[model samples]
Target: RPTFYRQELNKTIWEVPERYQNLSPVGSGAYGSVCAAFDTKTGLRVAVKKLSRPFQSIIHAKRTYRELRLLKHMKHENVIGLLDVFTPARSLEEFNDVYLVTHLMGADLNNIVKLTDDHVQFLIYQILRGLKYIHSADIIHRDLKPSNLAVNEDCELKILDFGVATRWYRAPEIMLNWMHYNQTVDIWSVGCIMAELLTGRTLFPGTDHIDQLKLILRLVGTPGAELLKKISSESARNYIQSLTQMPKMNFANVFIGANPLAVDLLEKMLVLDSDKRITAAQALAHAYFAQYHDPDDEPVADPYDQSFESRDLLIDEWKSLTYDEVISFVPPPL
Candidate 1:
């Protein structure tokens, strides 16, 4: 395998005979910004994540490289592909930027779900397809969320945003501070994404990191106080204790109510105890998605199928705006 280092990483990335351009900014994150660009030769659209400077710590920089390392070997229908890395020849010069090539999904799964009825089922199936392929290679996305998924002009879903996307989507292992986590994280994130898709919002809309835990408590029910003390950090235990002291919060009431399939799957995914939570492979067996998915099942959709009218519907909905006008639709950052 070709290993990568921080300084010269750009050298390898830019050396590829790929023409680069500065494109419009699509989204921004803690360490970088993803901009839309194209290959002059192929006239193909791509999203490039530019890291202007190393994140606050080199460790964060290393994680960026770790994400790139993993992306290099991954080729799944649902997962985004890292086409090339843009690096400079020397450290003192322009450092480096990572460029990824993905089939442009007109919008994110978060946005797409707002436009479909079976949105939850459709997204769940797509996520499982991508994560399964990822795990088959001994890699895990770890972060799986609605924003991480994109819906192409055809409404086909593709997973994107690896840095925090994978880690955030599948975070229980990290929360529990466990060592040997695998695809379960992807499964958990998928569940979170599904919940968001169903309700057209975030599963854990926490104000800060711990608020994520609060969101989990509201939806999934709180962990036993004594049990939490035994399993969690001192800070975590104290926080939970303080939260319990507050007025009781109803999770189910929060979303008004989710569909039976969505409720059941989200419950499994948001389980507080990481050690006991369901695995991605096991989630594939869940009755919730059992109706729509098949392990190793490659969905062969007919482009000519009139049943796939969601895109047509979306187009009609977007008819008021021209292509140039539509490009002006930029979503708020995560």
Candidate 2:
């Protein structure tokens, strides 16, 4: 084992380096726990997270590696900034826990309760703005819930991720397990989050996957026959089609006290037909964001997609890959 700073809390020990101080819990879940601390080296606060037992399973190992590899390529103000990655172990064999250090955000959007209309407009603008670059790079962030959206004191927003793989913000196509899904799923998630921002409530809080569809249908109504034919799963398509048809709801009625322009855009994003869902580029130009939208200011990123995601790498092999990544890694401006 390598020498490192040590701190204990709630029966668990954090073997982080001395660079990070004032360690305290920010969030905890199935995959890992996140803590906020000050980085003496940079004189800036950061989010220091330790992945719990990353090599527990080949499946889990794959996610850990992908997340590590993925963050290195991101270099946008609106995206999570990976400052450093390390393992307290000196060699690959001893490596087990992976610690990721990102610039710490004040709090996630889920914790914030009070926000004016202008606040929402800017928040959504930053989200779509960041998402536009990701999409331009041919990437899709299936997860985009409020908790993943980190906010700072001045309301500057940055997108981040965690486990719990939220269903409250899932799209209808994903709910049906559609064989061919695309980036539109992000729009549906944004729409779900927008609803929460407008009204202080979760629009579709489904208890389970089955209940998820019910909540979606209850809100946006049933799908047409043509869309059902595109579903790859026989059971899902037929089962949903077999249900009593549901009629769509009026946007203004449900999102009361919210701006008419905001509701109109939300309706487009939440459409059952993924093909018709408003795209990130389109959403940026929507009347709701007219004041904040600037064509020239939006930036596009280089394509960074890799096919190694599905490669059948063993736990040890994945461990080697992760060890290599953190062995001597540094963030680059992309």
Candidate 3:
């Protein structure tokens, strides 16, 4: 059988090593294309993400570096891991494109939102577990939409697609450019995602940043003056105040068919104040997860024992760091 290059209808597009045969496009995003292929050497199928011009700008460069570093350093069953990093280019000058090899799965949660209460429980548990791991590492996902969450037939799920994640699922503190935000930024996203899973729709499907705040307020109601005073941006605070104050909707009514315990947990997660939002660890211990809880199952520790104190990175340092990670790998056996 032919290998290395992919062809369909007498047309060729993707190319990889002879070891990864049966290459085919699985999906595409703003970042780049993802192809599903059989890794002949490992006798397993994998998803290859062809990152789009990662080094094109300082922002892209930093995102690429953070993703590579986080994937490599953080090891957990719920969180996605980096299988390999490679480029077809033979030299530094030619190494323009980057491919991230990862375990290929059934589909993203976006395509499988018809979840039962049981399925929702399991999925949310895994998400909280994953977030627990991420938070313990002092890292925020910044993005936690259904599309970034991959799921399989067995009901297993993993978080993916870290690119373009920042400041979107962002907590209000981060949105207002407050001094700094913490893991609760991700907690807010979890709340949004949980709401989506329950309703089979986006909870805060905002067209823009201001619109997102409106959507949030429309559901959970506006923040008190004390919280608004915490906003770092004076204009943002003024803009928020300009909006009409709304009353909080009943969670039970909002999440119809959802278990009362589950609704309680959701209410805790979707708080306007980041500090008031439940932490991933706290959420894991909530009554909703009682049936699924296994006292013996604890969070996995960071394999590399690396600390993530400085979340931000410089352009040149990011480039140098990611370059080293990419080239450090010894070629896998074909």
Candidate 4:
């Protein structure tokens, strides 16, 4: 049996399990709200994120599934771990809300990017290690910005906020809406993040989707005609052809004071053509990370067998599937 109650504090009411107490909201965003709570039953502090109207629309439903599914599937020290999932509703018909519990982090990568070169190397190494696990599983993170990366006082970094973060760190092929792209797009995003960490500014701060492409071109130079021919979108092909040919900016000029190895790795990652970009594992082996590379260290393997695939489902179908998932979970004991 389970107990339920409404706890009011800090101008919010949390309708949660009796085992969860002292709920205090820590942060919020478009996706939903997050709170730090004391798990009385386990004697631990955990992060709880209430999905914002998960069944409200098609997009929301799909995102809810993706976030839960991917987080559950990706098991690595640098990836956010899902501890538990539950909904207070007793019956399928009454179920609508969803909550995810995970390890609480001190802050995000954005807060600590100004630290010394050691932090930069350590953080970037962890990021690539996480990406290697993700890409190896045939999944693309799609987004890899600083804010989505969580960090602790010890400087351990973990990737978070997968759903709403899709657009910002997009690659050239993704921006062009070409038929398909691979994990290499994530590599490009890591390059952008690395640039930001070095220069203490967004590498390509685009106003909009198109402007993002232009900004990237200004720095990396536009792709040549052969790469353009591979694009499925005629408009995308034409748009690249119309842009003025620009020479690639010298990486040394941009990342002033950065080591030569660091600049070289950045150059390899920021290649406009996805085909030319280095893989996450290769990037991890780059001379820039020569000091941090650990041959014995390996990413953790996913313990669960659940799988999700792309599909269109009616709102009701999504609701039932989500409710079923919620009800089936049993929270781990302290």
Q: What TM-score would every model get versus the actual structure?
A: 0.62, 0.90, 0.82, 0.88
By descending TM-score, how would the candidates be arranged? Answer: 2, 4, 3, 1
Clashing residue pairs in candidate 4, if any?
A: none
Among the numbered candidates, top TM-score falls to 2
- Scored against the true structure, residue 269 in model 2 reaches a CA lDDT of 91
Q: Is candidate 3 or candidate 4 better by TM-score?
A: 4
**In model 3, where is the ten-residue run with the lowest total lDDT?**
1-10
Model 2 over residues 1-334: C-alpha lDDT tens digits?
3348877875677998787788888778788888999988878878888898899999889989889878888878898868989778877777888999888777789888846899889999999999998888777899889888888889899988765249888887776566467888998899888888878788888889889888788878887777777777887777877899999888788887788999999988988877778899989998999998989998888778678776998789988888888876865533
Overall lDDT per candidate, in order of appearance: 0.55, 0.84, 0.74, 0.78
Model 4, 1-334: lDDT tens digits are: 4787876654545678888887887877678888898888678789888878888998888778777776656557898877888778878788888889988887787676445677678888999998888777777777678778998878888987634234557787787676367789888888888877787778777778888778888888877767776778887777778878987889898888887888999999888777778998888888888888975785635444445455788888878877766666654444
Clash count, candidate 2: 0
User: lDDT tens string, model 3, 1-334?
Assistant: 2344544522324556677777777667678778888988789899887787788888888777767777776567888877777766666655566778888877787777456788889998998888878777667677777778888989898977634233446676666574357778888888777776777766666667777677778888887877776677777777777888898899898888778998999889888777677998888889889887775674855644444334566666667677788878543334
Better of 3 and 4 by lDDT: 4
- What's the residue-level lDDT of 46 in candidate 1? 66
Model 4 vs. true fold: TM: 0.88
Clash counts for all predictions: 10, 0, 0, 0
Error of 1 at 310 (Å): 47
Candidate 2, run of 10 with poorest lDDT: 325-334
